[PDB]
Amino acid sequence: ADVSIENSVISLSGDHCIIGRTLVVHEKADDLGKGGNEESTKTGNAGSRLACGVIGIAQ
Amino acid sequence: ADVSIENSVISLSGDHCIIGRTLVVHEKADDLGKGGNEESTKTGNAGSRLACGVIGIAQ
Amino acid sequence: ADVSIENSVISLSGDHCIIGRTLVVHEKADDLGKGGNEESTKTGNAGSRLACGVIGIAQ
């Protein structure tokens, strides 16, 4: 029960909640990606990663 | 139960909540990404990462 | 129950809440990103990260 924090970065967040009766979403997209290069070295992913997309409802 | 904080950065946040009866969203996008380069080295992701997108409702 | 804070940065926030009966959102976007470079080294993400987007309703 001894914590030692140093030259480091820490971030938290609380709990999000949306409570409704009706949820509607309309979307039109026309020209999103037009030759966008992308590089990645030693990255690792555990959630939802995406380039040039249209989600609709992300959680 | 001894905490030691040093040359470090710490951030928190509380709980967000939206309570409604009706939720509507309209969206038109035309030209978002037009040759945007992107580099990443030793990044790691655990949430929702995206380049050049249209979400609609992000949580 | 001994806390030791030093040459460090700490930030908090309370709880946000929106309570309504009707929630409407209209959006038109035309030209957002036009060759915006982006670099990242040793970053790490746990929430919602995005470049050149149109959210609609972010939480």
Numbering used by the authors:
A (entry chain C), B (entry chain B), C (entry chain A): 95 to 153
Reproduce, without paraphrasing, sentences from the article in which this PDB structure was first reported.
The AFM images, cryo-EM micrographs, and two-dimensional (2D) class average images using RELION3.1 revealed that both G93A and D101N self-assembled amyloid fibrils made of a single protofilament with a left-handed helical twist.
3D maps of the G93A fibril and the D101N fibril revealed a single protofilament intertwined into a left-handed helix, with fibril core widths of ~8.1 nm and ~6.3 nm and helical pitches of 240.6 nm and 65.8 nm, respectively. In sharp contrast, the hydrophilic side chains of Ser107, His110, Glu132, Ser134, Thr137, Asn139, Ser142, Arg143, and Gln153 are located in the interior of the D101N fibril and form a hydrophilic cavity. Importantly, Asp96 and Arg143 form a salt bridge with a distance of 2.7 Å to stabilize the G93A fibril core, whereas Asp132 and Arg143 form a salt bridge with a distance of 2.9 Å to stabilize the D101N fibril core.
